A paper describes a structure:
The Lactobacillus S-layers are anchored to the cell wall through interaction with teichoic acids (TA), either lipoteichoic acid (LTA) or wall teichoic acid (WTA).
The SlpA protein (~46 kDa) is the main structural component of Lactobacillus acidophilus ATCC 4356 S-layer, built of two domains. In SlpA_ac_I, the first ~20 N-terminal amino acids are not structured and reach out from the protein. A second interaction was observed within this crystal structure, a symmetrical homodimer interaction spanning from Asn92 to Asn176. The assembly is propagated in one direction by alternating SlpA_I dimers and SlpA_II dimers and in the other by the pore spanning N terminus of SlpA_I.
Residue numbers in the entry: 30 to 40, 48 to 66, 69 to 197
Amino acid sequence: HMATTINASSSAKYDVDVTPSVSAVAANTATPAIAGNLTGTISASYNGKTYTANLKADTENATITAAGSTTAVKPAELAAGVAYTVTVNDVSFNFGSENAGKTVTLGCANSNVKFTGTNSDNQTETNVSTLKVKLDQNGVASLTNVSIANVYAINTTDN
Ligand SMILES: [Cl-]
Ligand SMILES: [Cl-]
Ligand SMILES: [Hg+2]
């Protein structure tokens, strides 16, 4: 509990900074034609530490739509030059038993990112920039979704 070590390392509207990472690759038509693909992760920082988000499903944990459309797009059919919105469902952060019952606010500097879930006052918020949540008895935060708009599928670099 003593403090005898020189240190000098120095630690908004939110205190959990959520950074989604999406990598979409466009399909190519015929060389044999190549299917598109989509992968990614969601990470967060809280009290100087970084966490990786857990998803309820290994597969089918997200949905792609073209901007101004509600039709589901298979990752195999992604095209370049199309602004996509990726919605990731049943996203959780495990902030550990030491953070159990705490209230934290999730946010994101990137205006293309929005949250859907239950806030700390037990109200449903839909497509919001920031969300105040109550961590459960294990320190876990739960979101209905994270959405990322203006996702562009790149021309494959396998050439
Ligand atoms: Cl980001
Ligand atoms: Cl951020
Ligand atoms: Hg962000």
